[PDB]
Design an enzyme around this catalytic site. Structure first.
Site, PDB file in Angstrom:
ATOM      1  CG  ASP A 121      69.245   4.602 114.545  1.00 57.71           C
ATOM      2  OD1 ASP A 121      70.102   5.491 114.235  1.00 57.71           O
ATOM      3  OD2 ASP A 121      69.405   4.775 116.004  1.00 57.71           O
ATOM      4  CB  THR A 159      70.868   7.310 118.377  1.00 55.75           C
ATOM      5  OG1 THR A 159      71.298   6.816 117.352  1.00 55.75           O
ATOM      6  CG2 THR A 159      69.414   6.881 118.518  1.00 55.75           C
ATOM      7  CG  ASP A 261      72.688   3.341 113.412  1.00 53.21           C
ATOM      8  OD1 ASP A 261      73.248   4.354 113.085  1.00 53.21           O
ATOM      9  OD2 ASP A 261      72.868   2.546 114.279  1.00 53.21           O
ATOM     10  CG  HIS A 265      77.294   1.950 112.766  1.00 51.01           C
ATOM     11  ND1 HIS A 265      78.157   3.215 113.131  1.00 51.01           N
ATOM     12  CD2 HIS A 265      75.995   2.299 113.414  1.00 51.01           C
ATOM     13  CE1 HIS A 265      77.361   4.088 113.559  1.00 51.01           C
ATOM     14  NE2 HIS A 265      76.308   3.616 113.817  1.00 51.01           N
ATOM     15  CG  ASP A 308      68.242   8.483 114.394  1.00 53.44           C
ATOM     16  OD1 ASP A 308      68.316   8.053 113.232  1.00 53.44           O
ATOM     17  OD2 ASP A 308      68.741   7.667 115.541  1.00 53.44           O
ATOM     18  CG  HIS A 309      71.874   9.950 112.891  1.00 56.21           C
ATOM     19  ND1 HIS A 309      72.078   8.959 112.053  1.00 56.21           N
ATOM     20  CD2 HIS A 309      71.283   9.352 114.200  1.00 56.21           C
ATOM     21  CE1 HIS A 309      72.324   7.655 112.913  1.00 56.21           C
ATOM     22  NE2 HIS A 309      71.830   8.249 114.163  1.00 56.21           N
ATOM     23  CG  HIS A 420      75.605   8.313 113.040  1.00 54.61           C
ATOM     24  ND1 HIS A 420      75.058   8.790 114.114  1.00 54.61           N
ATOM     25  CD2 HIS A 420      75.255   6.953 112.996  1.00 54.61           C
ATOM     26  CE1 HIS A 420      74.898   7.679 114.777  1.00 54.61           C
ATOM     27  NE2 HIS A 420      74.835   6.665 114.110  1.00 54.61           N
ATOM     28  CG  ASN A 685      75.305  34.528 128.365  1.00 48.43           C
ATOM     29  OD1 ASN A 685      75.011  34.816 127.402  1.00 48.43           O
ATOM     30  ND2 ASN A 685      74.143  34.697 129.286  1.00 48.43           N
TER      31      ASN A 685
END
Ligand SMILES: *[C@@H]1O[C@H](CO)[C@@H](O[C@@H]2O[C@H](CO)[C@@H](O[C@@H]3O[C@H](CO[C@H]4O[C@H](CO)[C@@H](O)[C@H](O[C@H]5O[C@H](CO)[C@@H](O)[C@H](O)[C@@H]5O[C@H]5O[C@H](CO)[C@@H](O)[C@H](O)[C@@H]5O)[C@@H]4O)[C@@H](O)[C@H](O[C@H]4O[C@H](CO)[C@@H](O)[C@H](O)[C@@H]4O[C@H]4O[C@H](CO)[C@@H](O)[C@H](O)[C@@H]4O)[C@@H]3O)[C@H](O)[C@H]2NC(C)=O)[C@H](O)[C@H]1NC(C)=O
Ligand SMILES: N#Cc1cc(-c2cc(OC3CC3)ccc2F)c(OCc2n[nH]c3ncccc23)cc1Cl
Ligand SMILES: [Ca+2]
Ligand SMILES: [Ca+2]
Ligand code: NA
Ligand code: NA
Ligand SMILES: [Zn+2]
EC number: 3.1.4.39
Length: 805
Positions: A121, A159, A261, A265, A308-309, A420, A685
């Site tokens: 993560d 996530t 992660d 943070h 994931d990022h 993120h 659409n």
């Protein structure tokens, strides 16, 4: 209600989930509050820690220990991961020289190399280089295996959207997990990270890899680990499952780490505190590889190390507050932070108006750090609109910022230094990919690619047929030693007509005029040949695009360009032309300013008319092949054919004219010629897919001329820019865009300035993959090159991002 009085005796981390109220011993039981009474005692043993020491070597088996150093541990599958090192004189995997894995080297009874996905993560791409000194295990995987310099996540860069895209190959709009927080108005239910509702199965669309596996007879370990199970136990459980008997042993496994992660943070992406989490993740990788080596699986298992990022620097003081813009701020619900999603607080309020909220959020402060969008106006590359869970009003937040409703929301919740969720082309959001194993290549670097592509590859690695997804199967064949999927080009559905001269000028009554009544056998034959296709080798470099749906269309040839003209939409589906490095830009002469000319190959009944544009006070027109790039005065007349005209709002014509007059020539100079394919797109659409006729919501007033939602261009040249675009011997280089066809330039806050200050910035925001254009048009490009089809697929998924390095 759980009857928690059954027992986990012999059932620890069982793979099948047993049914309520009977008590569970699988690793989801914690999350459901349903573990049996003895689950901690039996299944989460911690006695004596996670490592053998000299004095434990050969010990008497003691079933209380977390792991074992006794002589029978290998056969039991439950040694500490360092057992052979400490007790049998072996080396750690990381200390062994790397040696090519040319074939899988697997124990007897292994039907296929197992796959282990090691997901981390918040593992930002640049950690691979910047943390390499403290991550020796990871650095060996990376350098010995196959790696990309980074992998692009999906938007939003959160996530659950990214992990579930990894598992399904689907964009968030299609899988349903469109954020870490959500409201579904059909369900009248909310999804949150906290709590229970997130495990309800109605949230989760598509088909994740574990279900794909199961349905096709391949067994899967768990993909979701409960936060209270420590990392060392996760690893030991995987290694235990790998020692099961052939008929019971899974083939696909996942590990997840909450780090880096969690720390990111708190401390920011490069906080000095981030070194330790990176060290710890590497240690866990070293444990897995040593464990695999003990089991003689280290040259048998394929391992994917994937994030994931990423993570960006973000603080409380970089917060924009909707209360500084909107008077009505209490009539809205905001989903806040690194993206913004706005809806009405009450659907009982008929005085709620998106138009006025958008307008109050548009270009209101000179350094404004977010931009509002109706979701259908978001850059199409984000594919973030076609879900009822995605609110109509969206805010794209600049990197390093947050958006919130009111100040009180931020201090009654500075804690954090990292976050993120931003636009998925932002460098700080990029993450990692490494593939190591028999099926991956040896010491191979591959270009950056998108995480939507991996599901297909993971299916290929396990012999599975992928469920329908958004990857382009074959685009990642260059990662693999074997197990390639051998894709074939789709069949063309509609063959073109090739019309000759069939109509006299006086049969048309289009209301158009052109000052062109101006008159030789040498040059009469010459222009005949141009209309039969004599220059088509120059302007159509990669064959004609194939039309993959049923329709009626004409190929029209000209000196400077070729087009596929739709009799149904009354305009080209595509227009192809090549501009050499040496080409000259000229102006539209005075006498030709309002010139539109009937095309004698195409009936009046399948043509546009000038009267419609005269009567539509909002709509003007532009041209697909630019008159500015005509090869000669006489050739310029072709550019004014009614079959080259397309409808354009005057505001969009500012963008389009600057692209065609200035930018095409600039790109030809810089790239040593370019081939350009331009056309309309209709996606009313907002599903990312070509509209049928009966889906068009807007026409040029009084007419059957449909109005595009977007205009595209594909710009191709030689990757080796020492060769000109039209004589390229090797690989191609491409950039593309899908510009929204909007009646204002409200998106561009500096649009009252000269186009040189804002148009190229807009086009960069709306950068696209050729594949995105294929979905939107039902066209298949690059059908006749000298390149392999796999290579072409890779080219079609390329996104030119305009980020620096
Ligand atoms: C990315 O890849 C994906 C995967 O390939 C692409 O998505 C596919 O696109 C197809 C076309 O848009 C779409 O096909 C439709 O399938 C309908 C059956 O749908 C169910 O079954 C599938 C298959 O198992 C299932 O996956 C679906 O799951 C969706 O819905 C649930 C919740 O309801 C969610 O859990 C899940 O997240 C998923 O949601 C997403 O997709 C739906 C669309 O299905 C969206 O509405 C959501 O917003 C979200 O994005 C379904 O449960 C089928 O009924 C459709 O058939 C109509 O159209 C055909 C055309 O041939 C016509 O013959 C019929 O008349 C029929 O029309 C009738 O219904 C109309 C509407 O109600 C009505 O107006 C008519 O008058 C008729 O009564 C259609 O074939 C396919 O389902 C999805 N698959 C997935 C997984 O999303 C996606 O296009 C790719 N993106 C890009 C950019 O390329
Ligand atoms: N491919 C893939 C893949 C998918 C998932 C995943 C699992 C899911 O399980 C359903 C909820 C019961 C749902 C969605 C997912 F995408 C995943 O989850 C790791 C994880 N374990 N624990 C966490 N805690 C907080 C966030 C994520 C996870 C890991 C990988 Cl490698
Ligand atoms: Ca995450
Ligand atoms: Ca559409
Ligand atoms: Na007009
Ligand atoms: Na503007
Ligand atoms: Zn996070």
């Amino acid at each position: 209600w759980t009857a928690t009085s059954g027992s986990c005796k012999g059932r620890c981390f069982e793979l099948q989930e047993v049914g309520p109220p009977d008590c569970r011993c699988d690793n989801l039981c914690k999350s459901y509050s349903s573990c049996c009474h003895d689950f901690d005692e039996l299944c989460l043993k911690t006695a004596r820690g996670w490592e053998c020491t000299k004095d434990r070597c050969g010990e008497v088996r003691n079933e209380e220990n977390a792991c074992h150093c006794s002589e029978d541990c290998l056969s039991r599958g439950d040694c500490c991961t360092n057992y052979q090192v400490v007790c049998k004189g072996e080396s750690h995997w990381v200390d062994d020289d790397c040696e090519e894995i040319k074939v899988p080297e697997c124990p007897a009874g292994f039907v296929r190399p197992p796959l282990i996905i090691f997901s981390v993560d918040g593992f930002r791409a640049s950690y691979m280089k910047k943390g390499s000194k403290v991550m020796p295990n990871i650095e060996k995987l990376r350098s010995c295996g196959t790696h990309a310099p980074y992998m692009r996540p999906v938007y939003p860069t959160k996530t659950f959207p990214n992990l579930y895209t990894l598992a399904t190959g689907l964009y968030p709009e299609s899988h349903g997990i469109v954020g870490n927080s959500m409201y579904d108005p059909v369900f009248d239910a909310s999804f949150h990270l906290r709590g229970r509702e997130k495990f309800n199965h109605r949230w989760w669309g598509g088909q994740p890899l574990w279900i794909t596996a199961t349905k096709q007879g391949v067994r899967a370990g768990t993909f979701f680990w409960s936060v209270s199970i420590p990392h060392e136990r996760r690893i030991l459980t995987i290694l235990q499952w790998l020692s099961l008997p052939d008929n019971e042993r899974p083939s696909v496994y996942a590990f997840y780490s909450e780090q880096p992660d969690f720390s990111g943070h708190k401390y920011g992406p490069f906080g000095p505190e981030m070194t330790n989490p990176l060290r710890e993740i590497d240690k866990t990788v070293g444990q897995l590889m040593d464990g695999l080596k003990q089991l003689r699986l280290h040259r048998c298992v394929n391992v994917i190390f994937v994030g994931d990022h990423g993570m960006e620097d973000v603080t409380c003081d970089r917060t924009e507050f909707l209360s500084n813009y909107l008077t009505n701020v209490d009539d809205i619900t905001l989903v806040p932070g690194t993206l913004g999603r706005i809806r009405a607080k009450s659907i009982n309020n008929s005085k709620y108006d998106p138009k006025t909220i958008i307008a109050a959020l548009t270009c209101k402060k000179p350094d404004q750090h977010f931009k509002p969008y109706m979701k259908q106006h978001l850059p199409k590359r984000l594919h973030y609109a076609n879900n009822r869970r995605i609110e109509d009003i969206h805010l794209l937040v600049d990197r390093r910022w947050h958006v919130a409703r009111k100040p009180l929301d931020v201090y009654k919740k500075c804690f954090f230094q990292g976050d993120h969720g931003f636009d998925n082309k932002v460098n700080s959001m990029q993450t990692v990919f490494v593939g190591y194993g028999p099926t991956f290549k040896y010491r191979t670097k591959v270009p950056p690619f998108e995480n939507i592509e991996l599901y297909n590859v993971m299916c290929d690695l396990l012999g599975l047929k992928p469920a329908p997804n958004n990857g382009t199967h074959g685009s990642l064949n260059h990662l693999l030693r074997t197990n390639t999927f051998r894709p074939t080009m789709p069949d063309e559905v509609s063959r073109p007509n090739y019309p000759g001269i069939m109509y006299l000028q006086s049969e048309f009554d289009l209301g158009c005029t052109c000052d062109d009544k101006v008159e030789n056998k040498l040059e009469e034959l010459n222009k005949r040949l141009h209309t039969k296709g004599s220059t088509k080798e120059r302007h159509l470099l990669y064959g004609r695009p194939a039309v993959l749906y049923r329709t009626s269309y004409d190929i029209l040839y000209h000196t400077d360009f070729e087009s596929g003209y739709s009799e149904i939409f009354l305009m080209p589906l595509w227009t192809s032309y090549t501009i050499s490095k040496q080409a000259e830009v000229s102006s539209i002469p005075e006498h030709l300013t309002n010139c539109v000319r009937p095309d004698v190959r195409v009936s009046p009944g399948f043509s546009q008319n000038c009267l419609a544009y005269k009567n539509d006070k909002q709509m003007s027109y532009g041209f697909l092949f630019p008159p500015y790039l005509s090869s000669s005065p006489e050739a310029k007349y072709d550019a004014f054919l009614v079959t080259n005209m397309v409808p354009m709002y005057p505001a969009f014509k500012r963008v389009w004219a600057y692209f065609q007059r200035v930018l095409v020539k600039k790109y030809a100079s810089e790239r040593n010629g370019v081939n350009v394919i331009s056309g309309p797109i209709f996606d009313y659409n907002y599903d990312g897919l070509r509209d049928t006729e009966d889906e068009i919501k807007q026409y040029v007033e009084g007419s059957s001329i449909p109005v595009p939602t977007h205009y595209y261009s594909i710009i191709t040249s030689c990757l080796d820019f020492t060769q000109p675009a039209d004589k390229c011997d090797g690989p191609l280089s491409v950039s593309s865009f899908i510009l929204p066809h909007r009646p204002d330039n409200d998106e561009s806050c500096n649009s009252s300035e000269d186009e040189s200050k804002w148009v190229e910035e807009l086009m960069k925001m709306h950068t696209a993959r050729v594949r995105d254009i294929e979905h939107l048009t039902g066209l298949d490009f690059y059908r006749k090159t000298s390149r392999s089809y796999s290579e072409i697929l890779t080219l079609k998924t390329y996104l030119h991002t305009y980020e620096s390095e």
